[PDB]
């Protein structure tokens, strides 16, 4: 039903990781570049269709109100596997740091640790699949 301010800020963060040049819109090329960097290989037709399905005003790019509309209207395991680079079933701080700088983000050590702590339920200082799933659900 509702959308909290925390939920909107998370969708806004996600939008900004796709919006590589920070101009307020996501193009097919920015989408393509991000998806390839995370191991996917969309065709040009798929990228154009994906943008078109979200582009409600038809100007050919995605702004945040359109992105918010799709996210409010809408595989956590495949995402877990992006973060868990060595595949041992536990996301370490080092793996999270690495995943975040490959996204172009600037983080301190304390910041990465704060993110581990936020997801860490049992307190072993890592993030397992069940904790990952509970973060997103």
């Amino acid at each position: 039903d509702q959308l909290t301010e925390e939920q909107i800020a998370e969708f806004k963060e996600a939008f900004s990781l796709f919006d590589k040049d920070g101009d307020g819109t996501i193009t097919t090329k920015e989408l393509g570049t991000v998806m390839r960097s995370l191991g996917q290989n969309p065709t040009e037709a798929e990228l154009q269709d994906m943008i078109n399905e979200v582009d409600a005003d038809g100007n050919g790019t995605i702004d945040f109100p359109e992105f918010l509309t799709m996210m409010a209207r809408k595989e956590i395991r495949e995402a877990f596997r992006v973060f868990d680079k060595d595949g041992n079933g536990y996301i370490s701080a080092a793996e999270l740091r690495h995943f975040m700088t490959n996204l172009g983000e600037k983080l301190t050590d304390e910041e990465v640790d704060e993110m581990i702590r936020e997801a860490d339920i049992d307190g072993d200082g890592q993030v397992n699949y069940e904790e990952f799933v509970q973060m997103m659900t």
Partner: peptide, 19 residues
């Protein structure tokens, strides 16, 4: 710094990018 926003925002991008 909002640790939950930064982490969940990055996970939601991965979920979208891997469809």
């Amino acid at each position: 710094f909002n640790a939950r926003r930064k982490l969940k925002g990055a996970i939601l991008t991965t979920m979208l990018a891997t469809r």
